[PDB]
Design a protein around this ligand. Structure first.
Ligand SMILES: CCCCCCCCCCCCCCCCCC(=O)OC[C@H](COP(=O)([O-])OCC(O)COP(=O)([O-])OC[C@@H](COC(=O)CCCCCCCCCCCCCCCCC)OC(=O)CCCCCCCCCCCCCCCCC)OC(=O)CCCCCCCCCCCCCCCCC
Ligand SMILES: CCCCCCCCCCCCCCCCCC(=O)OC[C@H](COP(=O)([O-])OCC(O)COP(=O)([O-])OC[C@@H](COC(=O)CCCCCCCCCCCCCCCCC)OC(=O)CCCCCCCCCCCCCCCCC)OC(=O)CCCCCCCCCCCCCCCCC
Ligand SMILES: CCCCCCCCCCCCCCCCCC(=O)OC[C@H](COP(=O)([O-])OCC(O)COP(=O)([O-])OC[C@@H](COC(=O)CCCCCCCCCCCCCCCCC)OC(=O)CCCCCCCCCCCCCCCCC)OC(=O)CCCCCCCCCCCCCCCCC
Ligand SMILES: CCCCCCCCCCCCCCCCCC(=O)OC[C@H](COP(=O)(O)OCCN)OC(=O)CCCCCCCCCCCCCCCCC
Ligand SMILES: CCCCCCCCCCCCCCCCCC(=O)OC[C@H](COP(=O)(O)OCCN)OC(=O)CCCCCCCCCCCCCCCCC
Ligand SMILES: CCCCCCCCCCCCCCCCCC(=O)OC[C@H](COP(=O)(O)OCCN)OC(=O)CCCCCCCCCCCCCCCCC
Ligand SMILES: CCCCCCCCCCCCO[C@@H]1O[C@H](CO)[C@@H](O[C@H]2O[C@H](CO)[C@@H](O)[C@H](O)[C@H]2O)[C@H](O)[C@H]1O
Ligand SMILES: CCCCCCCCCCCCO[C@@H]1O[C@H](CO)[C@@H](O[C@H]2O[C@H](CO)[C@@H](O)[C@H](O)[C@H]2O)[C@H](O)[C@H]1O
Ligand SMILES: Nc1nc2c(ncn2[C@@H]2O[C@H](COP(=O)(O)OP(=O)(O)OP(=O)(O)O)[C@@H](O)[C@H]2O)c(=O)[nH]1
Lengths: 459, 51, 140, 320, 344, 54, 98
């Protein structure tokens, strides 16, 4: 794994030593090459997960997330090349450094073997994210958004640290493989219930859960494009990954401790898909769609079945690509008209015919058009929940209808109708922007072609 | 965070020196004489002394 | 002595209401006394009569909160047979918080006190059941 | 070996260097009074160092290349704009006055450092003690606001009490009609716009607040114009002035040491002129401030520390 | 001050804690405490303004009363055991009195009120000395008697200190007061683990000092004694913003930075000793500190407050103040988590 | 629910609680008289604690 | 011995109470500190004499030496307070509330 980690570190001296003209070219090219290198994790020809040392590992669940993290960084650098067009060279290099440091920390987090190291890195990722949001946002509410994002995570994370310390005291180790192989049942005492809550709360907040999601729309609305990209793509999946990892030692309490959160997620998916129907900010609409989609991942991981885990992983990857694509599409119009209101710009397909094609593809992936991996994950989560209880199909169907409605409403409002002719500043779409959308879409098509890569541990 | 009680406060001076009210100096007043051995018996020297 | 307080855990919860209510009222009154002492010390009253009035207010409010907590916990654990269930303490803590809010004439304080005090009382009951110790001695 | 406690212990004591003409002499007077000529002659005859009146560009001339800088770097103020539109709306009046007070404070620090380090006296034209006359004239004429006056008074209260006053003050008294006639004769297209009320306010301040105050602690010498001419007479008065007054008598080596330490760090000298009092006339704003700061740091001989700019010929950087 | 006085007072300041740390006799430990108390007052009242005199008087009265209580404990132990040292058979009330008096000297809540005021009233370098060097002597005595201290008393003091520091730091716009409340919080953490593992108390002391000294040095760089004053750093000295941000976040205790290790290891040891409730409460309330540090970071490094016209003259000048120690201590305080096992 | 009650119940309520505690705790008059009265109360409390704990 | 030591302990406690509860004069608090020192000195002297521990007789004198140094420093601070405000009332010493 060090063969992936170390070049990522060397990107930083490259950024700070490259000439001001060539810095973006060099950093983007070498980030692409590191993303290519990260594909060596897909060479698994047996059921024996990869264990490189005492400190790093890779499984079918970790490898897709690691590869997605490696792949995103070039895309974030490309997306950040325009709104950082006026900043000083030192400031541009600082932004590049923040993004690279986020990539390094996320890869280390997803390759971590110990829960305590996982915790240290999963909480270290906050500093670059707070810096990116607050130092490069455009509105006065970015400070409060950053405060929310930081403390929603910290409050839930402290109990996680306490629980990890308790587990290490009781067992003697936090190594995930040792915990999995020597796992034993938990007595249904009140103390063990509180341990379950302390183990799951940090990840549920990060997911986020329905009741504690207010930090996510704020962060997306106030964050720069790279901030929104990385956030939606990976920082939400940190919670799902942690839940999948740590639930192996919390059995059998899950069977009865999952009801409150299964219900919260199942209802909140509907309650946020509905908000998407009448959200005025496009970024807020995308954020609430993400909340509703992550409700499915929460529910599937809670019910814990071979189908639920695979569907959750596939949906994690598919959402990571699709939400980032939607955020980039929205930012393309934002960089031109300087407003996030959806009604402000209309009929944009009359002036950006190909950007409209990217819009349509992103929206179709969002509403889950077969055979897209979006629909693979959603369908298998639906089947697992149906096996759980046959009345979950009612909520799933309501959410499906609402998802179709708001997804197509976005397109009809923005790309269709009569052009808002008064906008003289609608410049032709940049080659950079079109390449960004293409790089978001092509991996989705290839993974639809070969979905075996993005199944999880179970299948 | 202002409070009803803290309302009457003010920020401290930029350099710790405060503009403090002038201090009255009340030098002691003594009627040296007339009935004094060294006043020559008919001199009322009113002395303002500091110590 | 102080064993009067440790007498709270003699008969199983849900029995000896009057006695448990007396104990909890004493605890609340003691806490209110200490709080009034600190408030009068730092933040002095304008007059001695005003200071004594504030001491009385704090002590009576705290005693009422404690009495309500104890009475509601016992009454719950008696009306429903559950003699050792943290929900009784949660209900008692919410009743104490509502008492605080009513005495202060504040709905927001009522609700926040209910939630916080209920959680604290439930955790205290869970600690007594599961054997946690506040202030453990060094065992290493 | 920069000056410090170690240097003071090993030597470099001020009282040792002080001599008969190790004084501070401050020439004062209304606009166009002969201050420049009088100060130049006094300095040349007494061996002291002449310090031309601090202006908008004193700091730029004293630091870096020595060349004047763009006004955006040197204060965003203009004396010509002050005279053209004294009652502006961008606060050029008070911005100019505060900048000039800061420049005068910096120059006074330089003069005190020179005197204490070498023992050679300094002849200054006006100073931080007499700067307030212009502000009072501005306020009386309505060019600034009471808040600006309060801010100026606060900065003066924070900064002035830390330095010793001048040994001798020399006030050239010339009446307002002659000030006006001299201004017209000089013929400055902008200076000529000064009203006579403004000059009368300056004279009123000089004669009401300044001279009585400075008489408490310094040696004051008031001259008419016909005596200010022929500077040899003024020098002959100074040469026999007896200084038995003021705070200069109670000083000793271990008071001059700390005064020198204060006056030697120009950053500490100007620390309090930049207090965060959000007066609109002086507040810049983040965008313009960052733009100007970056443009300044991009100037030749200003990107790095003085000894570390290879563009301006600095050498041996890798071993410094 | 002239050189003779400077030498003779700095030597006394240095000698006090050295005598306390090296003494075997409780009376000579008290003598070291008295040396510190007497020698520091002139440096507190050096500048001679009403606030300086008030701070000096408050410090003197509080610390003299605390020293008298400590001497009472010492004398009663001498009466009881015929020895000048606390033994296993020393009386519980004697040890409790000693603990309370030493906590008053340190500034642990509720004996904390004097500390923020005295810190506010004195120059920044004196505040650095007071909050760093003066804490060693009182803590050494406690570390010598750690098998004898009362866990209940110490944990009440510790949690009270954490809560009061966290809540005090929120309401302060004054940098010296914020430093004082940070001191109170970190001293609460230090005292929480004294009965269990004084090595971790020493570790927390060392990390706290290595974080606090650079913060005070950075404050002294421009005499930034207020949030608005420090906000002008982006104009007056931009290069220090990154290190100030990292030092503040480390003081708060964010994982990747070195300041995390004290809290993490202390929670580990408390849990090992089965101190779950107190450990959880402390770690939970140590987030208000992160909040009021992040507010400072917003005001100083992640935004740009309005600046003054006169600051251009500031920009013109050349500066030489930051020592070689600032960089060393800041790097050591922020980037040392990987070397965690060596520190413990 | 999303813009009103879920704001009031969790983030706004927590922020209000701690902003109330900070103002309650940091309104000190700055008088050594009151500070030492508080210290006396603390000493009495500790003595009582020890006495009743034996 | 026992009754004497109990009385000395109670006298020290009274002096400590007089120190803790102020009464508008800094000099009176300084005097209460002196009273505490005196009580402690008597206790140590009585204990040493009763034990015949002659080697511990230096300690009472050192107590007085350091108490006298502390009293001198306190009196100097009183001089400074009187210079600043005109009296030694502790009510004035409240500038650091803000
Ligand atoms: C069994 C399972 C079967 C699965 C099928 C599922 C059915 C779902 C139906 C979805 C309906 C989508 C739709 O209506 O069309 C939208 C969209 C709108 O096109 P348009 O209206 O002409 O827009 C013109 C532009 O505005 C202006 O440009 P233009 O008019 O000049 O035309 C230029 C041309 C340009 O064409 C290209 O540049 C092709 C380049 C492809 C690069 C692929 C690289 C792969 C790398 C491998 C390593 O077209 C495009 O611009 C499209 C760009 C995106 C192409 C990416 C490939 C998408 C494949 C989808 C699967 O058309 C499509 O791209 C759909 C493609 C066909 C759908 C799949 C049918 C199977 C074919 C497999 C071969
Ligand atoms: C855990 C238990 C084991 C203990 C381990 C140790 C634990 C650490 C202990 C706690 C650490 C805190 C230590 C505080 C040290 C001093 C703090 C202070 O107030 O000065 C601030 C001081 C400010 O220095 P500056 O900005 O250069 O001041 C300009 C001078 O005035 C520049 O002009 P200057 O010449 O006046 O400089 C001052 C002058 C004055 O020298 C003296 O007054 C003393 C000797 C006079 C002899 C005649 O010194 C000399 O030049 C030598 C005179 C010959 O900053 C520091 O250097 C402190 C360094 C940080 C040490 C922390 C280490 C933690 C590890
Ligand atoms: C991270 C926390 C970030 C807090 C935000 C700090 C900040 O906003 O800076 C001021 C920023 C305003 O920037 P500015 O007004 O253009 O001028 C500031 C420069 O110092 C303008 O001065 P300059 O252009 O003359 O000097 C620029 C300086 C570049 O120095 C910097 O300003 C950047 C230093 C932070 C680099 C962060 C590396 C990320 C590490 C990933 C792990 O030198 C270089 O260009 C290349 C030198 C190689 C990079 C220096 C790395 C040495 C220290 C490494 C310590 C790592 C601790 C972590 O806002
Ligand atoms: C896995 C990590 C996920 C991380 C998220 C994504 C970000 C990473 C981006 C990495 C960029 C490189 C893409 C690597 C993944 C590509 C997967 C893939 O396409 O597999 C090869 C594909 C499968 O073909 P096949 O051999 O028939 O599979 C049989 C299965 N029984 O063979 C093909 O058919 C490829 C060509 C098909 C083109 C079809 C176009 C349809 C329109
Ligand atoms: C051993 C036995 C320990 C029992 C512990 C009992 C706990 C009692 C509850 C705590 C009392 C706190 C008093 C208080 O509320 O603060 C009063 C004062 C603010 O003044 P005021 O505005 O009048 O208060 C309004 C209250 N609604 O605010 C203050 O004066 C600040 C007080 C800070 C110090 C409190 C220390 C309490 C803990 C002592 C540990 C030893
Ligand atoms: C127990 C009660 C102790 C005695 C209480 C005396 C009255 C009082 O309120 O204590 C405050 C007093 C300060 O007195 P003062 O500031 O002048 O205000 C008087 C207001 N009646 O404080 C004092 O005068 C000092 C009291 C010391 C008491 C020592 C002996 C107590 C014997 C019982
Ligand atoms: C389930 C456990 C996990 C959930 C934990 C929730 C903890 C979150 C705490 C985050 C604190 C947010 O703190 C936030 O501070 C900002 C300052 O920017 C306040 O900001 C707001 O304050 C008030 C409204 O109340 C307005 O007057 C002000 O203009 C506005 O900015 C918010 O009212 C407060 O909510
Ligand atoms: C469960 C334990 C967790 C504890 C820690 C969780 C973090 C909580 C942070 C508490 C502090 C939040 O601090 C928050 O600051 C903002 C401004 O910044 C205040 O915001 C304030 O705005 C203005 C004044 O500026 C007032 O009119 C308003 O009423 C007030 O809300 C909030 O009232 C305060 O709550
Ligand atoms: N508003 C304002 N204008 C000032 C200040 N100092 C100087 N000026 C202006 O700058 C000009 C200085 O006039 P001068 O008298 O010629 O100065 P000088 O040449 O050094 O001395 P003289 O020989 O007497 O003329 C006047 O227009 C005035 C000041 O502090 N405030």
């Amino acid at each position: 794994m060090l063969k992936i980690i170390l070049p990522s570190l060397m990107l930083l001296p490259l950024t700070w030593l490259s000439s001001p003209k060539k810095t973006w070219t060099n950093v983007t090219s070498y980030s692409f090459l590191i993303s290519l290198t990260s594909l060596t994790l897909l060479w698994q020809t047996d059921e024996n997960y990869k264990n490189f040392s005492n400190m790093f590992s890779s499984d079918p669940l970790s490898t897709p997330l690691i590869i997605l993290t490696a792949w995103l960084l070039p895309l974030m650098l490309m997306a950040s090349q325009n709104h950082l067009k006026k900043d000083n060279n030192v400031l541009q290099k600082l932004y590049i450094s923040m993004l690279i440091s986020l990539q390094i920390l996320l890869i280390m987090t997803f390759s971590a073997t110990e829960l305590i190291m996982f915790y240290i890195l999963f909480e270290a990722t906050l500093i670059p994210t707070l810096i990116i949001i607050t130092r490069w946002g455009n509105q006065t509410e970015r400070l409060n958004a950053g405060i929310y994002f930081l403390f929603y995570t910290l409050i839930g994370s402290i109990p996680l640290l306490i629980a990890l310390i308790l587990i290490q005291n009781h067992v003697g180790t936090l190594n995930l493989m040792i915990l999995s192989f020597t796992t034993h049942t938990l007595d249904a005492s009140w103390s063990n219930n509180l341990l379950w809550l302390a183990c799951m709360m940090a990840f549920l907040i990060k997911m986020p859960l329905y009741g504690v999601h207010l930090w996510l729309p704020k962060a997306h609305v106030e964050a720069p494009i790279a901030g929104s990209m990385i956030l939606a793509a990976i920082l939400l999946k940190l919670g799902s990954y942690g839940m999948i990892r740590i639930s192996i030692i919390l059995d059998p309490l899950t069977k009865y401790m999952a009801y409150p959160f299964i219900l919260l997620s199942l209802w909140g998916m509907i309650m946020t898909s509905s908000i998407c129907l009448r959200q005025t900010d496009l970024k807020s609409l995308i954020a609430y769609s993400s909340v509703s989609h992550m409700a499915l991942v929460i529910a599937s991981i809670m019910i814990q079945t071979p189908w639920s885990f695979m569907g959750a992983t596939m949906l994690m990857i598919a959402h990571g690509l699709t939400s980032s694509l939607l955020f980039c599409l929205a930012n393309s119009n934002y960089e031109r008209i300087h407003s996030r209101t959806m009604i402000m710009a209309r009929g944009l397909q009359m002036v950006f015919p190909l950007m409209a094609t990217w819009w349509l593809m992103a929206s179709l992936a969002n509403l889950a058009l077969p055979p897209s991996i979006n629909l693979m994950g959603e369908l298998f989560i639906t089947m697992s929940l149906f096996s759980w209880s046959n009345f979950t199909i009612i909520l799933m169907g309501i959410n499906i209808i609402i998802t179709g409605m708001y997804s197509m409403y976005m397109i009809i409002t923005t790309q269709r109708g009569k052009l808002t002719n008064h906008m003289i500043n609608l410049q032709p779409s940049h080659t950079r922007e079109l390449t960004l959308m293409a790089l978001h879409m092509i991996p989705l098509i290839l993974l639809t072609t070969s979905p075996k890569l993005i199944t999880g541990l179970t299948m | 965070y202002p409070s009803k009680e803290t309302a009457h406060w003010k920020p401290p001076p930029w350099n710790d020196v405060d503009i403090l009210k002038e201090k009255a100096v009340t030098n002691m007043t003594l009627n040296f004489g007339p009935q004094h051995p060294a006043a020559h018996g008919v001199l009322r020297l009113v002395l303002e002394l500091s110590g | 002595v102080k064993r009067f307080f440790e007498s709270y855990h003699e008969v199983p919860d849900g029995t000896q209401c009057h006695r448990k209510t007396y104990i909890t009222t004493a605890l609340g009154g003691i806490c209110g006394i200490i709080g009034s002492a600190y408030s009068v010390s730092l933040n002095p009253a304008d007059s001695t009569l005003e200071a004594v009035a504030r001491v009385g207010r704090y002590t009576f409010t705290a005693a009422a909160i404690g009495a309500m907590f104890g009475l509601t916990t016992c009454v719950s654990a008696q009306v429903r047979e559950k003699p050792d269930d943290p929900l009784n303490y949660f209900i008692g803590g919410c009743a104490g918080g509502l008492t605080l809010g009513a005495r202060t004439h504040s709905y927001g304080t009522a609700a926040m006190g209910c939630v916080y005090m209920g959680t604290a009382a439930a955790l205290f009951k869970i600690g007594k059941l599961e054997g946690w110790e506040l202030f453990p001695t060094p065992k290493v | 070996l920069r000056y410090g406690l170690l240097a003071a212990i090993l030597g470099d004591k001020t009282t040792k260097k002080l001599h008969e003409y190790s004084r501070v002499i401050t020439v004062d007077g209304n606009i166009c009074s002969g201050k420049n000529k009088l100060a130049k002659e006094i300095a040349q005859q007494l061996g002291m160092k002449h310090y031309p009146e601090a202006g908008i560009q004193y700091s730029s001339t004293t630091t870096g290349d020595g060349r004047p800088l763009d006004i955006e770097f040197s204060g965003s103020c203009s004396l010509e704009k002050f005279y053209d539109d004294p009652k502006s709306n961008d606060g050029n009046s008070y911005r100019l006055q505060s900048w000039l007070y800061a420049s005068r404070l910096l120059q006074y620090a330089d003069a005190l450092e020179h005197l204490l380090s070498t023992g050679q006296g300094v002849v200054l034209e006006r100073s931080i003690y007499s700067d307030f006359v212009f502000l009072e004239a501005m306020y009386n004429q309505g060019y600034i606001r009471k808040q600006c006056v309060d801010h100026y008074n606060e900065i003066k209260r924070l900064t002035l009490p830390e330095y010793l006053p001048p040994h001798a003050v020399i006030y050239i008294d010339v009446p307002v009609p002659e000030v006006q006639s001299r201004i017209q004769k000089k013929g400055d297209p902008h200076e000529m716009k000064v009203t006579s009320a403004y000059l009368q306010d300056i004279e009123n301040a000089y004669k009401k607040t300044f001279l009585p105050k400075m008489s408490e602690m310094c040696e004051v010498l008031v001259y008419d114009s016909w005596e200010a001419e022929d500077p040899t007479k003024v020098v002959e008065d100074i040469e026999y002035l007896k200084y038995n007054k003021g705070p200069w008598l109670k000083q000793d080596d271990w008071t001059f040491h700390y005064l020198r330490m204060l006056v030697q760090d120009k950053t500490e000298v100007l620390n309090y002129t930049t207090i965060p009092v959000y007066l609109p006339e002086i507040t810049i704003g983040a965008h313009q401030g960052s733009r100007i700061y970056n443009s300044f740091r991009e100037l030749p001989g200003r990107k790095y520390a003085p000894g570390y700019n290879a563009e301006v010929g600095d050498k041996w950087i890798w071993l410094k | 001050m002239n050189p003779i006085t400077l030498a003779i007072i700095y030597f006394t300041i240095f000698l006090g804690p050295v005598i306390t740390m090296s003494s075997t006799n409780l009376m000579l430990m008290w003598v070291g405490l008295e040396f510190s108390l007497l020698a520091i007052i002139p440096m507190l009242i050096n500048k001679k303004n009403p606030r300086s005199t008030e701070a000096a008087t408050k410090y003197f009265v509080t610390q003299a009363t605390a020293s008298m209580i400590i001497l009472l404990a010492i004398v009663l132990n001498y009466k009881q055991l015929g020895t000048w040292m606390f033994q296993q058979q020393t009386n519980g009330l004697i040890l409790n009195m000693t603990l309370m008096a030493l906590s008053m000297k340190l500034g642990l809540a509720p004996f904390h009120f004097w500390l923020p005021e005295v810190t506010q009233g004195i120059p920044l370098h004196m505040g650095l000395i007071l909050l760093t060097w003066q804490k060693i002597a009182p803590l050494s005595i406690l570390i010598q008697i750690y098998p004898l201290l009362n866990s209940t008393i110490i944990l009440m003091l510790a949690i009270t200190s954490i809560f009061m520091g966290a809540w005090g730091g929120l309401n302060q716009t004054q940098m010296r007061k914020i430093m004082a409340y940070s001191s109170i919080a970190h001293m609460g953490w230090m005292l929480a683990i004294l009965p269990y593992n004084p090595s971790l108390t020493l570790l927390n002391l060392m990390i706290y000092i290595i974080l606090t000294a650079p913060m005070f040095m950075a404050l002294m760089l421009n005499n930034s004694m207020t949030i608005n004053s420090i906000s002008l750093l982006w104009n007056k000295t931009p290069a220090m913003l990154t290190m100030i941000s990292l030092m503040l976040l480390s003081l708060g205790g964010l994982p990747p930075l070195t300041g995390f290790l004290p809290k993490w290891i202390i929670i580990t040891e408390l849990m090992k000793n089965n101190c779950l409730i107190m450990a959880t409460l402390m770690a939970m309330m140590a987030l208000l500190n992160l909040f009021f540090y992040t507010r400072l970071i917003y005001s100083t490094s992640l935004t740009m407050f309005p600046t003054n016209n006169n600051s251009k003259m500031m920009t013109h000048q050349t500066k030489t103040k930051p020592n070689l120690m600032f960089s060393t201590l800041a790097i050591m305080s922020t980037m040392t988590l990987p070397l965690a096992p060596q520190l413990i | 629910l999303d813009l009103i009650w879920l704001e009031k119940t969790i983030p706004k309520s927590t922020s209000t609680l701690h902003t109330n505690m900070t103002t309650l705790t940091t309104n000190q008059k700055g008088l050594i008289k009151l500070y030492f009265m508080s210290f006396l109360i603390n000493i009495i409390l500790i003595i009582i604690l020890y006495s009743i704990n034996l | 011995m026992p009754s004497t030591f109990f009385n000395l302990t109670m006298a020290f406690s009274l002096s400590l109470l007089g120190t803790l509860m102020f009464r508008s004069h800094l000099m009176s608090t300084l005097l209460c500190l002196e009273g505490m020192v005196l009580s402690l000195f008597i206790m140590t002297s009585v204990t040493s004499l009763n034990s015949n521990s002659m080697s511990s007789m230096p300690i009472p004198i050192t107590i007085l030496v350091f108490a006298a140094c502390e009293a001198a420093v306190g009196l100097a601070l009183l001089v400074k307070v009187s210079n600043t405000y005109g009296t030694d009332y502790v009510q004035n010493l409240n500038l650091l509330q803000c």
